[PDB]
């Protein structure tokens, strides 16, 4: 209509003016006197073998010892990182898996992909095997990410520009989140599991409200698709990884942009983003087979985790911040320290 | 120095590894094909002759084939196209009768141009199927081909026109030094496309073996 041709522009202009008036200083100016972190050297402590195809996702258990990896060979493997033993090996009905998750309690795992169905597996059964507890349907596009809120809830992001909250007991969509104009690629949950953020292909990110079901904030500033997102450990900031070879830091309270981590020698896109236990480091896997460690408070590179022969697709940090595990398209998993 | 439980866990892990290796060896000898198309272009007919992703299994001459159909995916292709980076061949279906309807031939040109020059399919052969043979002949018996092709100059006969679509489709493959595209005409009742696909996949397998040996 004629009204929307000016109302949206006026609202955007008002938001931009509020942001401009709210930016008194910059992060670099305040954290210019802080001492540098220094060079960070990490060595490959363990190497996990057994996958026969590209690895697309992985997750860490709450105990900081067990992890689950997903690959397009039709298998879901649970590893014991301390001894590199295979606790379980779940065979998937559909081999086009694109994501996986680990329940906080440790009883269930989830996976999904091009089949538009999120499958939930029960690990602790009296029969001694692993069986599919529930299969969720309703998404009209490929499923990109899934995270466990508790033992009876799960949040999924699909390629049909929607995110939904499920109820595992019944299988019905409890709430649906809309507003994006492109494929949603990843999401991360807040520490208190009351809010979460999603990164879509429309070069934007949003802050939802699980209890209510409405977008409370929208963040822009990128120039291409967004492939990764992660919350700061404090819970008042998050980082994004785009295809324009640039990671950025956004703050919920200020509703602004804080930093940008880019270098001339890097032109490839970012596939994963994660933080350290105290949030002083920011790791990110790239398409150039490397994984740079960024000083999150000064935007200076501190080290590189070279040693992968193909694209790095997944990246995670244990809950105690003791080790970093990366997975690449060469069907190998490495634990750094 | 391991205890009893640790030794038993190691034994279980070794058994899991053996099962994984056996499964990988079993699944590494199957032929994988990705079935593309512009929609309503004889894909159903081709499937007859042999939510999300759809898989079809058929056996020919003691060889197990897998066909993946991604027609139902309405999302962005740039995100999930890299999954099928290890497919042995790509099957493309284009309807000939749609030459004078709306323009669809130009959409097929665009789809073929996008697919054939992707950064992932730089060495993957493409099998091209042209459908609606008799229908196309019946249509060209009255409707000239110049409506679809403003620059065409030739006889209004099936033999000339069919070859003209052939060269225009094959010209888009501007990577002739590594990829070879195999083309075949077909209709509602042929009962010979299985042999053509078998020949194409045998050629691809021979070339892959030669590359693996380093001979060529």
């Amino acid at each position, epitope marked *: 209509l004629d009204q929307l041709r000016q109302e949206a522009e006026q609202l955007k202009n008002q938001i931009r003016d509020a942001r401009k008036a709210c930016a008194d200083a910059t992060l670099s100016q305040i954290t210019n006197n802080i001492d540098p972190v220094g060079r960070i050297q990490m060595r490959t402590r363990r190497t996990l073998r057994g996958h026969l195809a590209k690895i697309y996702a992985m997750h860490w258990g709450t105990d900081s*010892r*067990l992890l689950v990896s997903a690959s397009q060979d039709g298998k879901l493997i649970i590893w*014991d990182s301390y001894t590199t*033993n295979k*606790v*379980h090996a779940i065979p998937l009905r559909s081999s086009w898996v694109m994501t996986c998750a680990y329940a906080p309690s440790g009883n269930y795992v989830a996976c999904g992909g091009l089949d538009n169905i999120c499958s939930i597996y029960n690990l602790k059964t*009296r*029969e*001694g*095997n692993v069986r599919v507890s529930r299969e969720l349907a309703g998404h009209t596009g490929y499923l990109s990410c899934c995270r466990f809120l508790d033992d009876n809830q799960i949040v999924t992001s699909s390629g049909d520009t929607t995110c939904a909250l499920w109820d595992i007991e019944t299988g019905q969509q409890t709430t649906t989140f809309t507003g994006h104009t492109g494929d949603v690629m990843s999401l991360s949950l807040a520490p208190d599991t009351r809010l979460f953020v999603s990164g879509a292909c429309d070069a934007s990110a949003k802050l939802w409200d699980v209890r209510e079901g409405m977008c409370r904030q929208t963040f822009t500033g990128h120039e291409s698709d967004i492939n990764a997102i992660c919350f700061f450990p404090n819970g008042n900031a998050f980082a994004t990884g785009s295809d324009d070879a640039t990671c950025r830091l956004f703050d919920l309270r200020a509703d602004q942009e804080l930093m940008t981590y880019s270098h001339d020698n890097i032109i490839c896109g970012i596939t994963s983003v994660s933080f350290s236990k105290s949030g002083r480091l920011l790791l990110a896997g790239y398409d150039d087979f490397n994984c740079n460690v960024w000083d999150a408070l000064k935007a200076d590179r501190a080290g590189v985790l070279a040693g992968h022969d193909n694209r790095v697709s997944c990246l995670g940090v244990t809950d105690d911040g003791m080790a970093v595990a990366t997975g690449s398209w060469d069907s190998f998993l490495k634990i750094w320290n | *120095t391991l*205890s*009893a*439980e*640790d*030794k*038993a*866990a190691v*034994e*279980r892990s070794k*058994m899991i590894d053996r099962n994984l290796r056996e499964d990988g060896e079993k699944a590494a000898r199957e032929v994988k094909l990705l079935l593309l198309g512009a929609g309503e272009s004889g894909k159903s007919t081709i499937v007859k002759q042999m939510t999300g992703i759809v898989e079809t299994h058929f056996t020919f001459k003691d060889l197990h084939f897998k066909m993946f159909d991604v027609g139902a995916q309405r999302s962005e292709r740039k995100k999930w196209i890299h999954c099928f980076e290890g497919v042995t061949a790509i099957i493309f279906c284009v309807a000939l009768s749609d030459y004078d309807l709306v323009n669809r031939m130009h959409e097929s040109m665009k789809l073929f141009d996008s697919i054939c020059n992707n950064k992932w399919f730089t060495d993957t052969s493409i099998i091209l199927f042209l459908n609606k043979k008799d229908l196309f002949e019946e249509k060209i018996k009255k409707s000239p081909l110049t409506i679809c092709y403003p620059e065409y100059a030739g006889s209004n006969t099936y033999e000339e026109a069919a070859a003209y679509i052939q060269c225009q489709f094959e010209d888009l493959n501007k990577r002739k030094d590594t990829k070879e595209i195999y083309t075949h005409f077909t209709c509602s009742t042929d009962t010979k496309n299985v042999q053509f696909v078998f020949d194409a996949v045998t050629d691809v397998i021979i070339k892959n073996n030669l590359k693996d040996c380093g001979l060529f």
Partner: single-chain antibody
Amino acid sequence: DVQLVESGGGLVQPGGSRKLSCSASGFAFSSFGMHWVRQAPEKGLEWVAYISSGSGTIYYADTVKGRFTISRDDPKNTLFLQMTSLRSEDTAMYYCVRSIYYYGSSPFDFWGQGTTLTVSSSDIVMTQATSSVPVTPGESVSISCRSSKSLLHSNGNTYLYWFLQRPGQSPQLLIYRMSNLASGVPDRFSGSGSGTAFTLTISRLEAEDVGVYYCMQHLEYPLTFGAGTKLEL
């Protein structure tokens, strides 16, 4: 449901032979390791033999080593114990026990039913030193089991298990690794202690908890059970 049924009992003459079978139904038999545990009349339990998953590892008690044979047949879910040249000292009930070993697993989870085998005519020592304890309902009870060699391994795990046998019933797992609680067990039971000195505690002693308690070690594969502490009243 999960259940194990055994058969093959009866009277045997000295020096003879007999075959025992264990029929399993309700779980993944091929993914479990199977044990054979016998119990002489009023003389506590005693480990006999063990066969791993895939039949890749077999162990025997030295008292029957070279005399008994154990085998499994995954096709039809049956476990066999072939014994030849038996003597009068082998008269006892025989139990069929399952166990799966992985990180965080619960071995010795489920026990069989037992078949009578009436017949006519290094080595870690676990001690309980208690015979009977008369206790009224509603109180709290404590049971102490002591071993010879410390059971705390380098990994930090302390391999000690607690079992309870109700009158005329198969033993049930209660606590594994001296701190975990088996599934289906009420929270009243609790385990604690240090190396070489363990102790199990019951908070609210109620009915159906009367029986005999045994403590087992799982560090050195020759397994020894405790003498058994009986609970009366």
